[PDB]
Amino acid sequence: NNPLFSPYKMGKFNLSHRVVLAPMTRCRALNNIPQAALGEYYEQRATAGGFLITEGTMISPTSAGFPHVPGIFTKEQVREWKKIVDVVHAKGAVIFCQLWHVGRASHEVYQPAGAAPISSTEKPISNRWRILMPDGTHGIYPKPRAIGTYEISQVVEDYRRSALNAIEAGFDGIEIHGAHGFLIDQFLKDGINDRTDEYGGSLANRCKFITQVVQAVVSAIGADRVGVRVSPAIDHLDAMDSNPLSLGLAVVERLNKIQLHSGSKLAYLHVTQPRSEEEEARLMRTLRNAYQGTFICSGGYTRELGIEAVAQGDADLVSYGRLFISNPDLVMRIKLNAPLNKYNRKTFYTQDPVVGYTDYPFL
Ligand SMILES: Cc1cc2nc3c(=O)[nH]c(=O)nc-3n(C[C@H](O)[C@H](O)[C@H](O)COP(=O)(O)O)c2cc1C
Numbered sequence: 001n002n003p004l005f006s007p008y009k010m011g012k013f014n015l016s017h018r019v020v021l022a023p024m025t026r027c028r029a030l031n032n033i034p035q036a037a038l039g040e041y042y043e044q045r046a047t048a049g050g051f052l053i054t055e056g057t058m059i060s061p062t063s064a065g066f067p068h069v070p071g072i073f074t075k076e077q078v079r080e081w082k083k084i085v086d087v088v089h090a091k092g093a094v095i096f097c098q099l100w101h102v103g104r105a106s107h108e109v110y111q112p113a114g115a116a117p118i119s120s121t122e123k124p125i126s127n128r129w130r131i132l133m134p135d136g137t138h139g140i141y142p143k144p145r146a147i148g149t150y151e152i153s154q155v156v157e158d159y160r161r162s163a164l165n166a167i168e169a170g171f172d173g174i175e176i177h178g179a180h181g182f183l184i185d186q187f188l189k190d191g192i193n194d195r196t197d198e199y200g201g202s203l204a205n206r207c208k209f210i211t212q213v214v215q216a217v218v219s220a221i222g223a224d225r226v227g228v229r230v231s232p233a234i235d236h237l238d239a240m241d242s243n244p245l246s247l248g249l250a251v252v253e254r255l256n257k258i259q260l261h262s263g264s265k266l267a268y269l270h271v272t273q274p275r276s277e278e279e280e281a282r283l284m285r286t287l288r289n290a291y292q293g294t295f296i297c298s299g300g301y302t303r304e305l306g307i308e309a310v311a312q313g314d315a316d317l318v319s320y321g322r323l324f325i326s327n328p329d330l331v332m333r334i335k336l337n338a339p340l341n342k343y344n345r346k347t348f349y350t351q352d353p354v355v356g357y358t359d360y361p362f363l
């Protein structure tokens with residue numbers, strides 16, 4: 001028996017298998033409005049009782065750092081998302097909307113009035129990283145504006161309102177993007193967070209922002225409709241921590257406490273790992289062992305590694321990114337151990353509604 005096809009109860013959601021669509025920015029949501037193409041794309045990948053997580057979705061006009069990423073902060077965005085959610089639900093899938101603020105990982109071209117991006121810090125991402133521009137070239141990350149605690153509470157309210165909007169659009173839940181060097185990770189990581197106020201310094205202070213974001217969306221829509229994604233050991237966009245395991249465990253501690261205080265469990269904790277392998281595996285297993293709830297692992301998984309993760313108790317669910325780009329029927333291919341299609345990096349972030357998006361073939 002393939003352990004990826006044993007059913008799993010993710011809170012109130014009965015999943016038929018453990019293969020999850022990882023959240024992936026694809027830049028087809030032209031001018032930040034969800035498009036019919038997104039409906040075709042997610043419908044292609046939906047399975048009865050399968051769990052899907054959307055591309056990162058803007059919570060406010062200042063939250064974007066990629067072209068043509070969808071928002072969920074306007075009524076028009078909610079209206080267009082509803083159409084996509086309806087077609088996904090008609091295939092029997094569960095779908096969560098990932099709420100995403102990029103913080104300092106942006107550019108004047110993505111900001112209203114060309115304003116500076118916001119962050120925990122005034123320090124820019126270093127020169128070894130470059131941002132994809134709307135014309136397909138790569139540009140320099142600018143200096144961000146470090147926000148005060150009043151503005152922090154406004155961003156928290158943006159997460160809260162976007163979570164309510166996601167439920168209005170029919171989403172089963174939301175995922176907080178707290179990974180990969182974006183805004184929340186810019187508070188978590190001591191390689192970024194140089195604050196001297198109550199949001200910087202100690203582990204507890206660096207965890208304050210993610211705790212307040214999660215608390216706000218839990219209060220708005222319920223813990224069982226909230227998943228949280230973090231990546232303590234991934235240093236994307238200069239997001240290094242001096243002790244990734246300690247940071248990860250501090251986050252897990254706060255999530256366990258939110259659950260006790262709310263009297264209910266989160267939908268899940270979702271952790272991406274970098275790709276020795278043994279040290280990374282032990283870090284992941286330690287986070288899983290410490291967290292009181294459902295654990296989704298992600299990052300470089302294959303059919304074999306996903307089977308092993310569930311069989312060994314290292315994870316409850318396994319999310320796949322790049323192979324799901326090029327294999328719309330990845331779930332069926334994993335079930336049959338069928339050959340997988342190659343994915344084309346060149347069309348990860350282009351705008352065509354078909355080419356490199358919905359034209360990868362089925363079996
Ligand atoms: C094109 C692309 C877009 C991605 N966009 C997001 C995103 O919007 N939010 C997020 O949390 N992770 C994003 N990721 C990371 C994936 O969710 C996932 O963790 C990674 O692809 C898993 O590794 P795998 O591709 O080997 O399966 C993206 C990855 C790719 C390749």
Ligand SMILES: COCCOC(=O)/C(=N\O)C(C)=O
Nearest residue numbers: 024025056066177179180236
């Ligand atoms: C492909 O990069 C691996 C980690 O994923 C990211 O950093 C990400 N979003 O989290 C985007 C939009 O790419």
